[PDB]
């Protein structure tokens, strides 16, 4: 039974190599996008927003925006088929142009899912995705931003938490995986706001149209004592969603301090059978709402067996320290 403080040397100890330049990747890419059309823009999002530093084994997330797009600060997201063609067309175009500039990298167009996008990989350090005509990435990525400028320490225990994910097959990007980054990032919010660490943000008060395109680098200092304090959060966190989050009645959510119902969201058995999601069906054994889209779960692909591995995964993670031992 581990103490705080050995949970915590052992992290600190863990970080050592990573505590020791997407500018040029923006530009790159934006050389294309005029190539395509020169009045639009380009936005960027994701964990080099959320945590204001870019680490090694993740790749960037990047949106193309018109003028219009960008005015209507406060919008929603349509889910129309309509729209959806729009997207897929200009991201063709979009993705054949970089093939023309890049010849050897692997530029794939994906279909088939709720939000077109294309995906480019190249050799050593080039990774990343794109998307059009959206701005609830980049919204919610401003959230997250602002609620770690709240207290720049804990971006420490997010971080960890991630690559913990990616270690045991819970992330999405693994196979068997049922929860994203995203997701993950939404349940440390969440614990962090029920022990009144964070003060609450109403998701409607971020804007559009006053965020930077590419925000600026946040400092990460190492922590000084060692790593109590990560040690604790670590512990409290596990314990929190073990014995205190009660996944048969409650829903984890930012649109709301307290607690959301379930039932106040009509996400039970009887709405499992009628929901029907890219023709598969959505799941409410764990249920995590969306602070923009709309009637959303992001633990839809959550089943029993997925819920099980979940729960063994958070009790065998405070004996091991997040497999650092
Ligand atoms: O379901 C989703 C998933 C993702 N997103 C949007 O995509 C952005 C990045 O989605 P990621 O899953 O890649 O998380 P991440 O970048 O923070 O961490 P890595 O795994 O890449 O290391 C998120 O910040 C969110 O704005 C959604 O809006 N909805
Ligand atoms: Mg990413
Ligand atoms: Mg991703």
């Not at 080099?48 to 600060?73: A, C, R």
């Not at 500039?101 to 167009?109: D, M, P, Q, R, Y």
């Not at 969201?265 to 069906?281: I, Q, Y």
Request: proline share 5%; aromatic share 8%.
């Amino acid at each position: 039974p581990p103490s705080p403080a050995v949970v915590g040397r052992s992290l600190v100890n863990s970080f050592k190599q990573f505590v020791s330049h997407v500018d040029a990747t923006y530009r790159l890419v934006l050389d294309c996008v005029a190539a395509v059309d020169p009045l639009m823009r380009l936005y960027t999002f994701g964990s080099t927003v959320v945590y204001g530093v870019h680490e090694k084994g993740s790749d960037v997330d990047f949106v193309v925006l018109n003028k219009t797009d960008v005015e209507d600060g406060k919008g929603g997201d349509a889910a129309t088929q309509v729209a959806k063609g729009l997207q897929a067309d200009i991201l063709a175009k979009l993705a054949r142009v970089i093939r023309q500039k890049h010849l050897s990298w692997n530029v794939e167009e994906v279909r088939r899912t709720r939000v077109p996008v294309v995906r480019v990989k190249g050799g050593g350090a080039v990774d990343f995705d794109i998307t059009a005509y959206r701005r609830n990435g980049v919204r919610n990525s401003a959230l997250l931003r602002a609620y770690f400028e709240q207290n720049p320490p804990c971006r420490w225990l997010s971080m960890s938490i991630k690559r913990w994910s990616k270690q045991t097959g819970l992330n999405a990007s693994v196979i068997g995986g049922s929860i994203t980054s995203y997701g993950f990032n939404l349940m440390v919010v969440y614990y962090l706001l029920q022990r009144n660490h964070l003060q609450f943000v109403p998701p409607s008060t971020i804007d559009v149209s006053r965020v930077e395109p590419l925000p600026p680098h946040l400092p990460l200092e190492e922590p000084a004592d060692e790593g109590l304090e990560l040690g604790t959060q670590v512990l409290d966190f596990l314990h929190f969603f073990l014995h205190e989050f009660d996944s048969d009645k409650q829903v984890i959510s930012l649109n709301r301090p307290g607690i959301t119902t379930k039932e106040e969201l009509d996400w039970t058995k009887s709405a499992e059978d009628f929901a029907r999601m890219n023709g598969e069906k959505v799941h409410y054994q764990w249920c995590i709402e969306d602070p923009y889209e709309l009637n959303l779960n992001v633990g839809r692909n959550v089943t029993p067996l997925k819920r099980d591995f979940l729960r063994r995964h958070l009790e065998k993670a405070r004996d091991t320290a997040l497999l650092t031992i």
